[PDB]
Amino acid sequence: SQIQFTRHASDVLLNLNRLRSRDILTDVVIVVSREQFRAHKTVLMACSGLFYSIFTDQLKRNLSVINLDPEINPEGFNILLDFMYTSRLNLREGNIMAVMATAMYLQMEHVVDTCRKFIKAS
Amino acid sequence: SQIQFTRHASDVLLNLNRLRSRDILTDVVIVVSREQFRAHKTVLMACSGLFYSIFTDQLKRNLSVINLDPEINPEGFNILLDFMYTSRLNLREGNIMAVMATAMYLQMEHVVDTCRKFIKAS
Numbered sequence: 001s002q003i004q005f006t007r008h009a010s011d012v013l014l015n016l017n018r019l020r021s022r023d024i025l026t027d028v029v030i031v032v033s034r035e036q037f038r039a040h041k042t043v044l045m046a047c048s049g050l051f052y053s054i055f056t057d058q059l060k061r062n063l064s065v066i067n068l069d070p071e072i073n074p075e076g077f078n079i080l081l082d083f084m085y086t087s088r089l090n091l092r093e094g095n096i097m098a099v100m101a102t103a104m105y106l107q108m109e110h111v112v113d114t115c116r117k118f119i120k121a122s
Numbered sequence: 123s124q125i126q127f128t129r130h131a132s133d134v135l136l137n138l139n140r141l142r143s144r145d146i147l148t149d150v151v152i153v154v155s156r157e158q159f160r161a162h163k164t165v166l167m168a169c170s171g172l173f174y175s176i177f178t179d180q181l182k183r184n185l186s187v188i189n190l191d192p193e194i195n196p197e198g199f200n201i202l203l204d205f206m207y208t209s210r211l212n213l214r215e216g217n218i219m220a221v222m223a224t225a226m227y228l229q230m231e232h233v234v235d236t237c238r239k240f241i242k243a244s
């Protein structure tokens with residue numbers, strides 16, 4: 001019975017990305033080898049099984065720094081972080097393997113499955 | 123050139139609402155007369171000109187309690203808060219005026235315009 005606003009969720013996500021771009025209310029830095037990326041824990045939890053499992057635990061919920069596995073490619077992480085905030089996944093031949101492995105680690109199944117589709121289509 | 127995930131933003135918003143329902147990483151209580159509502163400031167900012175203007179200001183960004191105008195109907199606020207987190211607006215004959223006035227106060231134009239449409243259609 002409710003009126004549905006079909007662009008609202010996309011508009012929210014765009015505004016959340018705008019807040020990230022201005023470092024407004026970001027509450028964690030994710031450290032990936034020599035690079036650092038600020039984010040909102042709520043968005044990370046919404047998009048990643050790894051981050052969900054980390055921050056749901058009261059033991060870890062208040063952490064302000066998360067150090068990822070040093071084997072994780074920073075570019076691959078950046079691609080996925082941008083995906084979380086945009087719904088747009090930049091997959092190429094040159095990044096597919098890194099992106100797929102990073103998405104497995106972050107526990108992002110739809111991206112992993114899309115990577116499998118990308119592989120099949122080339 | 124990016125692959126588009128058409129359900130991702132909706133899925134993010136659903137997960138943010140799930141976090142709200144469990145009081146996970148909520149960072150503000152909004153006080154509306156005798157009622158209180160917990161939320162994520164980032165979502166409020168993403169959906170409301172009033173909350174955007176409040177929390178962007180470094181003077182007010184860290185506030186944990188916001189007291190709304192005592193004239194604001196708590197039910198009307200609740201309807202709009204649920205809209206922010208769901209994209210679904212519960213407009214009825216019995217709540218339209220309160221919802222419209224609350225949306226004006228919260229600076230949520232698309233809802234206000236939809237309220238104007240609802241009035242025109244009855």
Ligand SMILES: Cc1cc(-c2cn(CC(=O)Nc3cc(N4CCOCC4)ncc3Cl)c3ncn(CC#Cc4cnn(C)c4)c(=O)c23)cc(C#N)c1O
Nearest residue numbers: 045046047048049052104107108109110111133134137140
């Ligand atoms: C929106 C979105 C979410 C997830 C995704 C999020 N999460 C975390 C999660 O589930 N969070 C929440 C769950 C609930 N619940 C609802 C009520 O019932 C219980 C849960 N409530 C609030 C939050 Cl924040 C994910 N967690 C796991 N996976 C799966 C995976 C994987 C994988 C791939 N390879 N490997 C090794 C593992 C997800 O995809 C997401 C992945 C993608 C992708 N790709 C995506 O576009």
Ligand SMILES: Cc1cc(-c2cn(CC(=O)Nc3cc(N4CCOCC4)ncc3Cl)c3ncn(CC#Cc4cnn(C)c4)c(=O)c23)cc(C#N)c1O
Nearest residue numbers: 011012015018167168169170171174226229230231232233
């Ligand atoms: C997604 C969504 C947003 C807004 C809405 C949000 N905001 C706050 C805002 O604009 N936040 C941000 C803006 C930017 N910028 C992008 C780059 O350029 C600058 C801005 N970046 C990040 C954030 Cl969080 C709104 N603020 C104002 N209004 C308009 C109004 C009104 C009104 C109605 N009656 N009265 C008296 C006032 C909005 O609708 C929204 C309203 C609705 C509705 N209905 C809706 O479904």
